[PDB]
Design a protein around this ligand. Sequence first.
Ligand SMILES: *SC[C@H](NC(C)=O)C(=O)O
Length: 130
Amino acid sequence: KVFERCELARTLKRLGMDGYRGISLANWMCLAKWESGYNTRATNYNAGDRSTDYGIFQINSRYWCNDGKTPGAVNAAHLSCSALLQDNIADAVACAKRVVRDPQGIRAWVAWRNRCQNRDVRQYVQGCGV
Ligand SMILES: *SC[C@H](NC(C)=O)C(=O)O
């Protein structure tokens, strides 16, 4: 599903992302925008390393979700990448939380560094009531 900007912002607040490990909702929004255009169906195959990025946050199959086809990856005891292609983003949020629990935080996503860090990201949440 393709989320409307404010619909997404309110959803992320409800799932407790505002200020999670010091990350503002505006930062999480900036991240979803440049990663998938707020599209839960988004999939990006990295030919170079044979991994795939899945969902609204473009989570990778080598480190975080199991898809079976990715070489040198986390096993089948971990969350299925399919769970990140659902309309309901609860699993994706729970996984995004885990990713930033690493010392690297939100910097784990290179798109965040390019397009969001050291920027006025107020625009992503202005007028949403969050
Ligand atoms: S981010 C999803 C999570 N992955 C790892 C590697 O802990 C899981 O729930 O398995």
